[PDB]
Amino acid sequence: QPSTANGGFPSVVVTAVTATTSISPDIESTWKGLLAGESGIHALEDEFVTKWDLAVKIGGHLKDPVDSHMGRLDMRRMSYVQRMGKLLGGQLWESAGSPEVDPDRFAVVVGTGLGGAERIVESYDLMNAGGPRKVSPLAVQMIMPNGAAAVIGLQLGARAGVMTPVSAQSSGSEAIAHAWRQIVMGDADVAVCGGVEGPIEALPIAAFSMMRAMSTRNDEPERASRPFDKDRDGFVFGEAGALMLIETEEHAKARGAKPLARLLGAGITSDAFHMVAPAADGVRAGRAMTRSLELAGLSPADIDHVNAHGTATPIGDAAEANAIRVAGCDQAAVYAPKSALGHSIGAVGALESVLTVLTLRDGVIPPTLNYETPDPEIDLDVVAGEPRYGDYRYAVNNSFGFGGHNVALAFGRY
Amino acid sequence: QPSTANGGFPSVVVTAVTATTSISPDIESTWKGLLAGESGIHALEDEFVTKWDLAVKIGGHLKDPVDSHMGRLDMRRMSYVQRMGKLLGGQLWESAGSPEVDPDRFAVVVGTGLGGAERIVESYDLMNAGGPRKVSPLAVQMIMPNGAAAVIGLQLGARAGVMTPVSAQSSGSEAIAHAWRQIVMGDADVAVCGGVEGPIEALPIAAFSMMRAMSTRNDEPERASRPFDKDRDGFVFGEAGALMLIETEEHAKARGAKPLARLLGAGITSDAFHMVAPAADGVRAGRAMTRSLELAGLSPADIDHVNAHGTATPIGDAAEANAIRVAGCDQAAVYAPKSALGHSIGAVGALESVLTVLTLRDGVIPPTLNYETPDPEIDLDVVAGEPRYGDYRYAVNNSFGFGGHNVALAFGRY
Numbered sequence: 090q091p092s093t094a095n096g097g098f099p100s101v102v103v104t105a106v107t108a109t110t111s112i113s114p115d116i117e118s119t120w121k122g123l124l125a126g127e128s129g130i131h132a133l134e135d136e137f138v139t140k141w142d143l144a145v146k147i148g149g150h151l152k153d154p155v156d157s158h159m160g161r162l163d164m165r166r167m168s169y170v171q172r173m174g175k176l177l178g179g180q181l182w183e184s185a186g187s188p189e190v191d192p193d194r195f196a197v198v199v200g201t202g203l204g205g206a207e208r209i210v211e212s213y214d215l216m217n218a219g220g221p222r223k224v225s226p227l228a229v230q231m232i233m234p235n236g237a238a239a240v241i242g243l244q245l246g247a248r249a250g251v252m253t254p255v256s257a258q259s260s261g262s263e264a265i266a267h268a269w270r271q272i273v274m275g276d277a278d279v280a281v282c283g284g285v286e287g288p289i290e291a292l293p294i295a296a297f298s299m300m301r302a303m304s305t306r307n308d309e310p311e312r313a314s315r316p317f318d319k320d321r322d323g324f325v326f327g328e329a330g331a332l333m334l335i336e337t338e339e340h341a342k343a344r345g346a347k348p349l350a351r352l353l354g355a356g357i358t359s360d361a362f363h364m365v366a367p368a369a370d371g372v373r374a375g376r377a378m379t380r381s382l383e384l385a386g387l388s389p390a391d392i393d394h395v396n397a398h399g400t401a402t403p404i405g406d407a408a409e410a411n412a413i414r415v416a417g418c419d420q421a422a423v424y425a426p427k428s429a430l431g432h433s434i435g436a437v438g439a440l441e442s443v444l445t446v447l448t449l450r451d452g453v454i455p456p457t458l459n460y461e462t463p464d465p466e467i468d469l470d471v472v473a474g475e476p477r478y479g480d481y482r483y484a485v486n487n488s489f490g491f492g493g494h495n496v497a498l499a500f501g502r503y
Numbered sequence: 504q505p506s507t508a509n510g511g512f513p514s515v516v517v518t519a520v521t522a523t524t525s526i527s528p529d530i531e532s533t534w535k536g537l538l539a540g541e542s543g544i545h546a547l548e549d550e551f552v553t554k555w556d557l558a559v560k561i562g563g564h565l566k567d568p569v570d571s572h573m574g575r576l577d578m579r580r581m582s583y584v585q586r587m588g589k590l591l592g593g594q595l596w597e598s599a600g601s602p603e604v605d606p607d608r609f610a611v612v613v614g615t616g617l618g619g620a621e622r623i624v625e626s627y628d629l630m631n632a633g634g635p636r637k638v639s640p641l642a643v644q645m646i647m648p649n650g651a652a653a654v655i656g657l658q659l660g661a662r663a664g665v666m667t668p669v670s671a672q673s674s675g676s677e678a679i680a681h682a683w684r685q686i687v688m689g690d691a692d693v694a695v696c697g698g699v700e701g702p703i704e705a706l707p708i709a710a711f712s713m714m715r716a717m718s719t720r721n722d723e724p725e726r727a728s729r730p731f732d733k734d735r736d737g738f739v740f741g742e743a744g745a746l747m748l749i750e751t752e753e754h755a756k757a758r759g760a761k762p763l764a765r766l767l768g769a770g771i772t773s774d775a776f777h778m779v780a781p782a783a784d785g786v787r788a789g790r791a792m793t794r795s796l797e798l799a800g801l802s803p804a805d806i807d808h809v810n811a812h813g814t815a816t817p818i819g820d821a822a823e824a825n826a827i828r829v830a831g832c833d834q835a836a837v838y839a840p841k842s843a844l845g846h847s848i849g850a851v852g853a854l855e856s857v858l859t860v861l862t863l864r865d866g867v868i869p870p871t872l873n874y875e876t877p878d879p880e881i882d883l884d885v886v887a888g889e890p891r892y893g894d895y896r897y898a899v900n901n902s903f904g905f906g907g908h909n910v911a912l913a914f915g916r917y
């Protein structure tokens with residue numbers, strides 16, 4: 090029975106990470122902010138909020154907007170998730186030391202929730218106003234949801250496959266799972282993986298608001314996202330994109346890269362319960378966690394830390410507490426980063442996987458913000474108030490998505 | 504190292520297929536039609552053609568529209584690709600004998616090019632006319648590109664993962680590739696897999712036309728799609744969707760399912776060349792074919808048949824001919840079904856995978872339509888004029904996608 094622990098799968102390490110967030114464009118600065126209790130969530134100052142008088146008037150825009158780094162041709166030839174992909178792909182490579190790798194052993198797996206959807210609406214308006222010849226010859230390649238992964242693949246020269254798993258809010262973690270499978274199956278030795286997502290805009294706010302999923306605590310934006318708290322009232326948008334570089338331990342050693350963590354195993358399951366509510370019992374979600382432990386070669390008692398999906402809906406957080414119990418991981422120290430960074434949909438599982446790596450690298454879990462009144466249906470060890478220090482040696486990052494998708498990633502200290 | 508031939512992977516069999524096409528809603532009648540030299544391509548009668556005076560006036564709508572099978576509630580609460588996926592998933596399951604399987608060992612993998620995009624422009628229009636509270640509460644779950652796979656997962660009860668790989672025109676084959684991986688890695692014993700795609704409409708025609716990729720042979724619609732022909736001048740749309748049921752041979756035998764064929768291995772690579780032109784040398788595309796043979800345990804000398812992606816662009820077919828040579832597969836009999844069925848984008852690799860399976864089951868390849876003047880740069884054995892009967896044992900199905908994606912599937916006669 091192959092596991093990582095028993096040498097049945099090659100050892101896979103994380104050797105570089107990059108992310109842009111509502112706190113900082115610099116992941117090390119985001120991480121210092123989080124440990125200091127900073128939130129990226131503010132009053133939205135966009136004119137679209139007053140134009141439409143939106144019920145939701147809070148969110149975290151990126152600290153450093155993607156397009157301040159894009160030249161004239163990038164703005165007219167890529168959709169926004171493609172520009173974010175290019176920006177992060179170059180940062181990651183530079184952070185990695187700009188390695189010269191074998192392109193034929195180099196894969197890219199990048200998830201996103203939707204793709205270049207603004208170009209859909211642009212092409213629709215252009216054609217309605219001026220006919221079919223007003224549609225750009227670039228529209229197809231900007232719009233297609235594999236667009237961002239493909240821009241990264243072209244940019245960095247990856248020829249062992251470029252893949253885009255889409256599973257709504259779990260896409261960013263699912264991508265890192267498929268990258269790990271591609272390596273252990275022997276299709277690649279090195280992979281860039283993670284997730285990108287669009288910015289906060291009026292139409293996405295309108296659509297999730299009609300699901301009654303979003304916090305409307307507009308008077309205290311930094312207090313609004315309260316995962317696992319008794320007084321939680323839904324999620325808050327917080328923009329992000331994140332990528333990491335993973336490679337076999339052999340490949341990293343040959344080029345002198347210092348690992349940040351190990352990526353030990355991944356589990357994907359599905360609920361077959363409901364399209365937009367997680368099964369309350371957490372059973373299939375718990376089993377995604379268990380399967381990541383089986384592939385890693387770990388037991389539940391090994392898991393020191395869980396990085397919760399923790400969206401701060403009443404229903405979502407209760408199902409996830411039940412899933413953590415099913416997996417036997419409810420004595421782990423838990424963090425819910427959406428408390429501070431909000432929800433970035435297709436990117437967020439990637440961002441939170443990067444945070445999980447940093448917890449293992451640095452031996453610390455940031456405080457979950459706004460965690461003030463424990464909820465008795467949630468009987469979890471939620472880290473709050475101040476950071477929790479410790480010699481953490483194994484952690485699980487959870488992500489789930491509309492459609493019933495459950496993804497868990499098992500990481501270890503290097 | 505593990506292969507199907509050496510027993511390192513479990514044996515995986517195809518036990519049911521379903522597809523709706525421009526020739527027939529019934530895959531067995533599609534197949535009889537193809538063998539009789541029928542084309543599904545006609546003059547488009549839609550009012551949108553004359554409204555916009557589109558340069559392209561030809562293509563193949565489904566013989567039997569998806570929505571002649573849909574209630575008005577489904578029409579309001581699913582996107583088109585979800586409706587297609589629900590229709591096909593129920594037909595497939597019925598064809599399989601409505602098996603009772605273990606939901607926790609049952610996965611769904613279904614690709615699509617874009618997703619529920621008509622609900623994006625609908626939501627946009629609604630909000631522009633009446634504000635954010637006019638957007639449907641179901642809009643997110645109809646729009647998300649994992650929506651179709653998730654509908655099928657919920658309909659059929661799949662709890663071992665629901666996955667949507669997006670790779671533009673290769674998505675449908677890539678979905679069968681990941682379903683095969685999901686079974687051989689031990690995450691599932693049974694999977695529903697394939698591709699769905701939306702119908703021909705004005706804005707998709709405008710966007711692909713503006714790339715100068717489409718045939719405009721409007722006076723002779725059935726003669727327009729000419730893969731590998733010297734006078735080819737671009738692709739023709741032909742609607743489709745297709746799913747197959749795959750399962751371990753053990754699982755099939757246990758429920759008394761007769762296999763249609765064996766699914767032996769899958770190879771996925773990428774070009775890192777250009778976003779919308781394939782690499783002219785065919786090298787990475789050929790290595791996708793080679794990887795599928797490695798995993799099957801086959802050599803190129805074993806291959807009897809290649810089902811070509813064969814879009815009928817000048818550069819596309821030339822690059823694929825080079826690919827087949829790189830893989831050592833250029834002595835095989837080649838069929839290009841887009842000649843008769845046209846291009847259905849995210850569904851097409853699934854449709855052509857089902858055709859490959861029927862070639863192997865029945866020992867016959869349909870004629871490539873319109874193949875009249877051999878092109879010296881192609882130098883392939885293109886089956887043409889009449890169906891070719893033979894004792895086919897091993898076949899490769901090729902699909903490629905914008906972004907530089909290459910997918911090959913190796914199938915065997917059962």
Ligand SMILES: CCCCCCCCCCCCCCCC(=O)O[C@H](COC(=O)CCCCCCCC[C@H](C)CCCCCCCC)COP(=O)(O)O
Pocket residue numbers: 169202203204205206207210257258286287288289290292293296297326327328329432433434435491622623626627642643646647648
């Ligand atoms: C991280 C939190 C946010 C997550 C939100 C994720 C939602 C999906 C991502 C959508 C991508 C949007 C990209 C925006 C690019 C941009 O900025 O376009 C502005 C101007 O506005 C626009 O064009 C808005 C056009 C809207 C595009 C259609 C969005 C449809 C959303 C659906 C109705 C609801 C969400 C579906 C989500 C499904 C997947 C996840 C479950 C440039 O402005 P200017 O320079 O022209 O002045």
Ligand SMILES: CCCCCCCCCCCCCCCC(=O)O[C@H](COC(=O)CCCCCCCC[C@H](C)CCCCCCCC)COP(=O)(O)O
Pocket residue numbers: 208209212228229232233234583616617618619620621624671672700701702703704706707710711740741742743846847848849905
């Ligand atoms: C097989 C060939 C086709 C392949 C085409 C693939 C393109 C993707 C298809 C997307 C889904 C289309 C579903 C249409 C639903 C339908 O039928 O709605 C009509 C009324 O028109 C409409 O609303 C058209 C709505 C337009 C939707 C936006 C399409 C944007 C397309 C992009 C600009 C260009 C294509 C990008 C593809 C990228 C991915 C693949 C590389 C019935 O009207 P009614 O009488 O029922 O009221």
Ligand SMILES: C=C/C(C)=C/[C@@]1(C)SC(=O)C(C(=O)C(F)(F)F)=C1O
Pocket residue numbers: 258302323324360363364365366367368400401402405432489490491492493494
């Ligand atoms: C099957 C539905 C699932 C997994 C829904 C979850 C918990 S996953 C997710 O991100 C999410 C949210 O965004 C929401 F709606 F705010 F809670 C959810 O409601």
Ligand SMILES: C=C/C(C)=C/[C@@]1(C)SC(=O)C(C(=O)C(F)(F)F)=C1O
Pocket residue numbers: 672716737738774777778779780781782814816819846903904905906907908
């Ligand atoms: C990287 C670009 C690729 C693989 C383009 C291909 C050959 S894949 C594909 O389906 C396709 C077409 O549909 C087109 F445009 F008709 F030729 C192509 O142009």
Ligand SMILES: [K+]
Pocket residue numbers: 396397398399438441442486487488
């Ligand atoms: K998480």
Ligand SMILES: [K+]
Pocket residue numbers: 810811812813852855856900901902
């Ligand atoms: K093919």
